[PDB]
């Protein structure tokens, strides 16, 4: 015979609890990647982005190593 139902209250805040949030942790990850890729793509033209990030990527990085010949540069 059962006298009482068996349960606990899980900690919660602003209507979030850890079981639920834990399911969304990976989604925040992917959105973070999406925002990272997007941001980097937006500033791909900035010379510092190329110098410090993009030209350092292996294989692919040579796409961003481009020199103007000294004969063709007024400045």
């Amino acid at each position: 015979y059962v006298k009482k139902p068996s349960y606990k209250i899980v900690p919660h805040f602003l209507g979030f609890n850890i079981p639920t949030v834990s399911k969304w942790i990976p989604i925040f990850g992917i959105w973070g990647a999406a925002a990272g890729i997007g941001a980097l793509f937006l500033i791909e033209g900035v010379p510092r982005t190329r110098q410090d990030i993009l030209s350092k990527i292996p294989i692919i990085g040579e796409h961003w190593i481009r020199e103007i010949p000294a004969s063709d540069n007024p400045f």
């Binding site: 000294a70 004969s71 063709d72 540069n73 007024p74």
Partner: peptide, 13 residues
Amino acid sequence: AWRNLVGVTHTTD
């Protein structure tokens, strides 16, 4: 300007 010719018709020099 002279810079305008550079890399169009003439070299920097």
